[PDB]
Design a protein around this ligand. Sequence first.
Ligand code: RXR
Ligand code: CL
Ligand code: CL
Length: 164
Amino acid sequence: MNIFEMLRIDEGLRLKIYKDTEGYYTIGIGHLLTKSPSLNAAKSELDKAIGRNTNGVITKDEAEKLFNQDVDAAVRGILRNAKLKPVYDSLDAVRRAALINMVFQMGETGVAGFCNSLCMLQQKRWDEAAVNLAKSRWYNQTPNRAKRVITTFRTGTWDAYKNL
Ligand SMILES: *SCC1=C(CS*)C(C)(C)N(O)C1(C)C
Ligand SMILES: [Cl-]
Ligand SMILES: [Cl-]
């Protein structure tokens, strides 16, 4: 297991434009295209992202390319965020992946809003952090995924992704 395989499990793979859990146009492996309600707007974002006229469909190679860029960007973003970097730096590699997973899903600003939980993680109070992480819109709206990510923070193991 690693961050790519983890997010591949959590995000799935679809080669046509689809709506994510929040209703937003997305493609590939959880590549958000736009929050616009316009499918044409989403198609324009897609073409811009891929570099050709796609008409809403991409290949697996193209999906994986956007995914690599998205993971890279998530990580590099954490390292540039003054609130996130110290927490990330304090973690082991497995828990680092859990934090990247959250950023991938909700963005740096979203994750910065978990300051109560982030402080507990930095302190290595794993059970307490796990309890606090579940007190969130995130957990309520995507409970199965949140549970997997929280288990990863709690245990520092890949147990929640083993049979998946
Ligand atoms: S998110 C609140 C913050 C934390 C966690 S206790 C820390 C990384 C220490 N930090 O610099 C703050 C004040 C942004
Ligand atoms: Cl992009
Ligand atoms: Cl879920």
